[PDB]
Design a protein around this nucleic acid. Structure first.
Ligand SMILES: [Mg+2]
Ligand SMILES: [Mg+2]
Ligand SMILES: [Mg+2]
Ligand SMILES: [Mg+2]
Ligand SMILES: [Mg+2]
Ligand SMILES: [Mg+2]
Ligand SMILES: [Mg+2]
Ligand SMILES: [Mg+2]
Ligand SMILES: [Mg+2]
Ligand SMILES: [Mg+2]
Ligand SMILES: [Mg+2]
Ligand SMILES: [Mg+2]
Ligand SMILES: [Mg+2]
Ligand SMILES: [Mg+2]
Ligand SMILES: [Mg+2]
Ligand SMILES: [Mg+2]
Ligand SMILES: [Mg+2]
Ligand SMILES: [Mg+2]
Ligand SMILES: [Mg+2]
Ligand SMILES: [Mg+2]
Ligand SMILES: [Mg+2]
Ligand SMILES: [Mg+2]
Ligand SMILES: [Mg+2]
Ligand SMILES: [Mg+2]
Ligand SMILES: [Mg+2]
Ligand SMILES: [Mg+2]
Ligand SMILES: [Mg+2]
Ligand SMILES: [Mg+2]
Ligand SMILES: [Mg+2]
Ligand SMILES: [Mg+2]
Ligand SMILES: [Mg+2]
Ligand SMILES: [Mg+2]
Ligand SMILES: [Mg+2]
Ligand SMILES: [Mg+2]
Ligand SMILES: [Mg+2]
Ligand SMILES: [Mg+2]
Ligand SMILES: [Mg+2]
Ligand SMILES: [Mg+2]
Ligand SMILES: [Mg+2]
Ligand SMILES: [Mg+2]
Ligand SMILES: [Mg+2]
Ligand SMILES: [Mg+2]
Ligand SMILES: [Mg+2]
Ligand SMILES: [Mg+2]
Ligand SMILES: [Mg+2]
Ligand SMILES: [Mg+2]
Ligand SMILES: [Mg+2]
Ligand SMILES: [Mg+2]
Ligand SMILES: [Mg+2]
Ligand SMILES: [Mg+2]
Ligand SMILES: [Mg+2]
Ligand SMILES: [Mg+2]
Ligand SMILES: [Mg+2]
Ligand SMILES: [Mg+2]
Ligand SMILES: [Mg+2]
Ligand SMILES: [Mg+2]
Ligand SMILES: [Mg+2]
Ligand SMILES: [Mg+2]
Ligand SMILES: [Mg+2]
Ligand SMILES: [Mg+2]
Ligand SMILES: [Mg+2]
Ligand SMILES: [Mg+2]
Ligand SMILES: [Mg+2]
Lengths: 122, 147, 257
RNA sequence: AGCACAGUCUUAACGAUGGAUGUCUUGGUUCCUACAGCGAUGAAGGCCGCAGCAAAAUGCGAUACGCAAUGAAAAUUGCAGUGACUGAAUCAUCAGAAUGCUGAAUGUAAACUACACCAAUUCCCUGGGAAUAGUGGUACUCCUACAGAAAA
RNA sequence: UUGUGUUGAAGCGAAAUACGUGAGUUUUCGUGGAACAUCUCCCUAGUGCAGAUCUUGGUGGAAGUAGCAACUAUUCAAAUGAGAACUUUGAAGACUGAAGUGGAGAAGGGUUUCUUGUCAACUGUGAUUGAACAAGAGUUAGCCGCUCCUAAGGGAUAGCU
RNA sequence: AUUUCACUCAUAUUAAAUAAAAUAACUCCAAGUGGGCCAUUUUUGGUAAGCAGAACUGGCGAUGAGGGAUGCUCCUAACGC
RNA sequence: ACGGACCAAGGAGUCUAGCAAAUGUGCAAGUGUAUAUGAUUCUUUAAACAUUUUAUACGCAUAAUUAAUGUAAUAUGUCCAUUGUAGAUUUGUGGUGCCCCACUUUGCAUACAAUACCGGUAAGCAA
RNA sequence: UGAUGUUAGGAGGGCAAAUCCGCCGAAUUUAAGCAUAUAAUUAAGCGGAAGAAAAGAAAAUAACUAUGAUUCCUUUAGUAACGGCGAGUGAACAAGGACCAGCUCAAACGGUUAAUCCUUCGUUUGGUGCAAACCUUUCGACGGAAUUGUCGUUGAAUUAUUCCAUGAAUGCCUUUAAUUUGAGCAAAGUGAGCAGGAAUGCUUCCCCAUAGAGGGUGAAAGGCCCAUAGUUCUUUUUAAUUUAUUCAUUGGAAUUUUUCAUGUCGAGUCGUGUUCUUUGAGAUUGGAGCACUAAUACGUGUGAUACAUUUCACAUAAAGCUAAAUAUAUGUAGGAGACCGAUAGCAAACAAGUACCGUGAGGGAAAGAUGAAAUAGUACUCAGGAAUGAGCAAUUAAAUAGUACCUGAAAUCGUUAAGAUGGAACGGAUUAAGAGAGAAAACAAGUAAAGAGGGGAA
């Protein structure tokens, strides 16, 4: 690392650890940034992205569009938004994969689990 | 460094410097000190004359600590003193130094050189040679034996 | 070093003369297209390396203590000549003096922003600029061996005791630190070049006479060390050539052919 | 509508065949540091099985790509299916339970799913009921104790 | 130390009113799609190929050439099919000649067996055929055998080395 | 024999001639080589030989250019553009 | 006379020990901080820095010679530094152009010899 | 006394080896041949253990003013010695360091009483657990072992000072510093403009740093995500610091003052002769087989040349145990490099000790890359029995990136054009005729007029 010699800074090792991470670690890696308004109401800076949140697309060809998150794909490292779509060569409709770090989430969907986390973070 | 090695100069030539007719074969005259006394005789005789044969008596379990004996000549005997201390013994004529060479690692006092005329000195040691002892007696000194 | 037997783990042997093939050893057997190929020999695919590398190659050197001390001393002296520091690539055109001593308040700064402000006020703005712009991604296979970047060397801050300088001046690209009683030629002459830019604290500057024996002190002065002398008294040759005494001995200029 | 002989060789331009060159790397190699055996309470190795649709490699053992418990914690997905709306879908940890036939292999054997002797054996309710040809033991050498017989 | 690059790197193909005695260096156009130098001075090495009946891989002329010859022998008409000298049906002419390309077993093989489908490669000419490829099936014992007995022999126990 | 001291023997033309005579003298550390052949002249064995064995020089090997039609050794002559 | 049908990639004086010569560097009758230990050394750092709060670790050198017991380098008249021939540099006069000559002064390095002394061996004398 | 016993309770057997312990035992090679020698007290073979093993508390050095169990590092030293005295081989003591540690049995002594040990069945205390389970702790009984020898003392007494262990109830457990495990938190732009399919690029306006390690994200990111510096909590154990008060036995020990007693000390062993090995070991260094076979502390052994008569020094053989400093081509985990980059690096970057070969012991490969995204992998039409081709039609930034998919060299072959061509072809020198390409020297500063721009001063 920087000063403690007990963990690595090898490209090989922790580039192998990113692509074979277990499914319980993949949700911490898949985290987004909180808006300015949500950063006063909550003392956290960033949260892992969940399903029924609302996000603003900030980077890419679809920058500036908003909408709701309809699916999370932990194997491919991607999320899906409700009206951002594509046509295949057949003519069937699909969803364009978005990377969660390209996004900032503007409205949350709280529950029993979330509260006991935001409370600790504040 | 491989950068400055002689072999890099012969890299385009065929024989690498060892000749067309007499090649670089492997051990064409023997191994090590093989042929001496037969066909290496001249090299042995003109560079190492007394090599063959044996002479003298055997000593079966030597123990070199019994005969260790470093020496010092009477040349270097006034030089053991510092210059300022060497100086005052010249003016004053009533006092002489007493030197213990065994405190400096020397064992036997040996007698090459010249002492200063009429400048007495007293020396302690384990062994003396005859000439050294005479030269110390001549300038007005004394030799003392220790153990 | 390579593995100890890499290339020689097989029971191969040569077919001999006849059979209209070369005389290298060959793999035995059948049923796979490895059978019948040349096995070991530096010219054979899969064979052995010529002179396989070994761990008892002499990796290091031992250097005379007096020469190390000589080099360190002659390296500090080069730090005090303005033209040499300029010729090593340091942007010090606006500096006032090249030995460049600073008060002892430097020793107890605590924040990186303050250290950058100190560097800028001293006149070293275009020296802190050269270091930021200089970070690049290296060319070659060193990327695949944990050698991603390559940066240029900056000033070298020297102190006597640390009350924050260590933490304050880290994290600035290219800046390095060192203590007066443990000075390293590898830092004072990076790559073998001479003329490193140094910044001395006042106590660091005063310890330098006690270390080298002008003032004696127990367990600080180097024991029985004498500071090297020069075979020349004044290296200004052309001031000698132009003296009245010398010029009165010269002889009339002569003509070419 | 018409005109260039054919073959062979040379040069250019565009292609075919082939996989060199450059760039890439969840692999190798060496050194430094730390810990260290397993087995009759059946090891290492071998064989046979287990998924809704299932060959290999990977994981498991008649509870068989996984049970219970503890920490996280919404989905897993090729179809079909199962999931709170947090002992449940999935990931991690792993202390309880369970762990086929073999193998030192140890009742006799072995290119046999061959053949013995001894005790019938297991389960449910609190003395009654029920089930099953199913279960366990039996190598050799040795030590301590014991048992009687036999010899002196 | 001090530089190039999505306003296009390395590499590769063809070149130049270019420089050098020479090994080479430099530049234009095309392709290409992501990295590349340092000549300011130093350090370092698994550092320079025409050959070794050299190693591994790819490719020629010979060349549409040598050749596709044992086992007496084939013909007419129809069905199928995109397509029939070598698939099927009928009619002819013939062979094996019971010491048989007829029946039944052992060693060895292991699904080659049966029904259906079916042609990318194989079936050294064709092929709709097939022991090829795909889906599903098929082996029933008190009386046939093993299992039991002993043989030439093998392994063991006591003891001994 | 040696040691001193006194005297005196050409030199600018150099104790006879000529000299791109100091391109000299010496020490150190090492490579390759140690199968040769040919020509004029002298010369041994052999009937002889493009045979075998020696001597003094010069060559070929290690070397091309002009000539001998042709030719490793003959004649002229040895090599930056 | 032998190897070579063609093309691409690969392909052969190196590493360690021990000795010497040459050359560069440091110090110099000395030189080299071994194994260790210390430190307000600890991403790098397996590097770098230090040396035990009239000063006996060890190697090579400072002394040779003899099988060996062993013995061991002018000699006290003067801190002086053996003798001669040629010879670099210096000192004083004159000749032709700071240079070269003729004398005068000093006498490095080195070459050739002489002499004295140390260890071994002969010879002579020997308590 | 032996056999017997499916009597009760237990042990051994097999795997693995890099480092460790014991046995057995070559030749290649070198000597320029070769037989002693060397290779080597090595390779192969057979047995036995641990986190280390083995060694180890003097029958040792020395010859000094003396040191003081074993192991290992620096040196002694390529030295003393061995050798067809050839090629070759080769230790020990002293010196400087790492670490540091000592003990038991046998033999003396104990008989108004074997004091000793074990099995099985009982009981009696306090702490830790949710549970499972565990720790601590006295006192009985029956039976057996043992005088063919267990246990206590370490010559035995006497005299004074001092030290150690054991029992009760009323209290006392705070504070702090270091080693360890697992968690939580963790600053600062996703602002203009250009060009792009897409910024992490360029220009420009802000900032954080005790954090400018590394990875990810449609192109190079300190301010987009994980983490990084730092800090809080937590588990392990170990050092200081904080209180013990009163009373009550019984047995041990060290030294000192005097009294009397000189006891014991490892046998078919040590040693000698002889034969073979091994060592630097030499009229024999250690080991082994055979024959002979001791002494009793004044004895026995060592003091590197074989004897006899003696002096001196050192030590106390023939029974046993024991940490640390040392090693580690094995297994498992962690970290790193002036190392290799798919004919390289392990044989194996991939369903690799795999496919395949041999009756068997064994032998043993080849084979990585579309694109940012297939949650974009090729829809529709026409021709054809089909493969396949074509398009007015279609994904992408790109299909001459179409899955035999990055780039795509040479050998070899196809197409078009231009030339040459009486039994090889290509070359060196020197020019000519065609064809392709070219302006950086291969002419023109400046002057006047008008039009568009870009700078520097006052
Ligand atoms: Mg040459
Ligand atoms: Mg040759
Ligand atoms: Mg042939
Ligand atoms: Mg290899
Ligand atoms: Mg490169
Ligand atoms: Mg024609
Ligand atoms: Mg619960
Ligand atoms: Mg749970
Ligand atoms: Mg079992
Ligand atoms: Mg059995
Ligand atoms: Mg049978
Ligand atoms: Mg390059
Ligand atoms: Mg090479
Ligand atoms: Mg090559
Ligand atoms: Mg080639
Ligand atoms: Mg062929
Ligand atoms: Mg034909
Ligand atoms: Mg046929
Ligand atoms: Mg017939
Ligand atoms: Mg017939
Ligand atoms: Mg017949
Ligand atoms: Mg059939
Ligand atoms: Mg069929
Ligand atoms: Mg066919
Ligand atoms: Mg089949
Ligand atoms: Mg049946
Ligand atoms: Mg029957
Ligand atoms: Mg029989
Ligand atoms: Mg020869
Ligand atoms: Mg000639
Ligand atoms: Mg003629
Ligand atoms: Mg030949
Ligand atoms: Mg040939
Ligand atoms: Mg030298
Ligand atoms: Mg020596
Ligand atoms: Mg004498
Ligand atoms: Mg007398
Ligand atoms: Mg057994
Ligand atoms: Mg065993
Ligand atoms: Mg030989
Ligand atoms: Mg030989
Ligand atoms: Mg031989
Ligand atoms: Mg072995
Ligand atoms: Mg074990
Ligand atoms: Mg032990
Ligand atoms: Mg022991
Ligand atoms: Mg030693
Ligand atoms: Mg011997
Ligand atoms: Mg030996
Ligand atoms: Mg010692
Ligand atoms: Mg007793
Ligand atoms: Mg683009
Ligand atoms: Mg791009
Ligand atoms: Mg990054
Ligand atoms: Mg960071
Ligand atoms: Mg005894
Ligand atoms: Mg021997
Ligand atoms: Mg001795
Ligand atoms: Mg003992
Ligand atoms: Mg690595
Ligand atoms: Mg490979
Ligand atoms: Mg690409
Ligand atoms: Mg003709």
């Amino acid at each position: 690392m920087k000063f403690n010699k007990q963990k690595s800074s090898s490209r090989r090792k922790m580039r192998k650890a990113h692509f074979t991470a277990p499914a319980g670690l993949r949700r911490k890696i898949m985290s987004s940034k909180l808006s300015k308004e949500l950063r006063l109401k909550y003392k956290t800076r960033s949260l892992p992205v969940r399903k029924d949140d609302e996000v603003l697309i900030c980077r890419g060809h679809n920058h500036g569009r908003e909408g709701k998150v309809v699916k999370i794909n932990r194997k491919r490292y991607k999320i899906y938004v409700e009206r951002v779509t594509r046509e295949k060569v057949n003519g069937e409709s699909t969803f364009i994969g978005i990377h969660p770090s390209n996004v900032v989430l503007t409205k949350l969907k709280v529950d029993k689990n979330r509260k006991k986390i935001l409370d600790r973070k504040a | 460094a491989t950068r400055f090695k002689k072999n890099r100069k012969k890299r385009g030539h065929v024989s690498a410097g060892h000749g067309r007719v007499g090649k670089h074969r492997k051990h064409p005259g023997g191994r090590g000190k093989a042929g001496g006394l037969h066909h290496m005789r001249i090299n042995f005789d003109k560079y190492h004359p007394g090599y063959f044969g044996k002479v003298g008596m055997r000593h079966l379990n030597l123990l070199k600590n019994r005969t260790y004996c470093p020496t010092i000549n009477v040349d270097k005997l006034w030089g053991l003193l510092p210059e300022e201390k060497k100086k005052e013994f010249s003016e004053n004529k009533d006092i002489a130094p007493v030197i213990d060479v065994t405190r400096k690692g020397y064992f036997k006092v040996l007698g090459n050189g010249k002492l200063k005329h009429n400048q007495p000195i007293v020396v302690k040691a384990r062994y003396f040679s005859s000439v050294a002892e005479k030269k110390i007696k001549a300038v007005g000194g004394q030799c003392i034996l220790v153990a | 070093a390579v593995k100890l037997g890499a290339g020689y783990e097989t029971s191969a042997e040569s077919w001999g003369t006849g059979r209209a093939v070369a005389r290298i050893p060959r793999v035995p057997g059948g049923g796979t297209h490895r059978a019948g190929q040349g096995a070991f020999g530096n010219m054979c695919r899969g064979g052995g390396m010529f002179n396989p590398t070994k761990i008892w190659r002499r990796w290091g050197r031992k250097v005379n203590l007096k020469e190390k001390r000589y080099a360190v001393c002659s390296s500090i002296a080069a730090s005090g000549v303005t033209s040499l520091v300029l010729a090593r690539g340091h942007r010090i055109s606006h500096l006032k003096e090249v030995p460049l001593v600073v008060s002892n308040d430097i020793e107890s700064l605590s924040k990186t922003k303050e250290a950058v402000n100190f560097l800028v006020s001293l006149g070293l703005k275009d020296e802190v600029n050269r270091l930021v712009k200089s970070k690049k991604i290296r060319a070659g296979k060193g990327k695949m061996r944990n050698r991603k970047y390559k940066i240029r060397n900056g000033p070298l801050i020297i102190y006597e005791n640390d009350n924050g300088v260590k933490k304050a001046f880290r994290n600035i690209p290219g800046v390095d630190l060192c203590k007066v009683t443990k000075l390293n030629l590898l830092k004072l002459a990076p790559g073998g070049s001479i003329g490193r830019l140094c910044i001395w604290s006042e106590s660091a500057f005063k310890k330098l006479d006690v270390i080298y024996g002008k003032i004696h002190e127990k367990k600080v002065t180097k024991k029985n060390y004498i500071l090297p002398k020069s075979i020349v008294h004044n290296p200004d040759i052309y001031r000698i050539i132009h003296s009245d005494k010398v010029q009165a001995s010269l002889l009339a200029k002569k003509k070419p052919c």
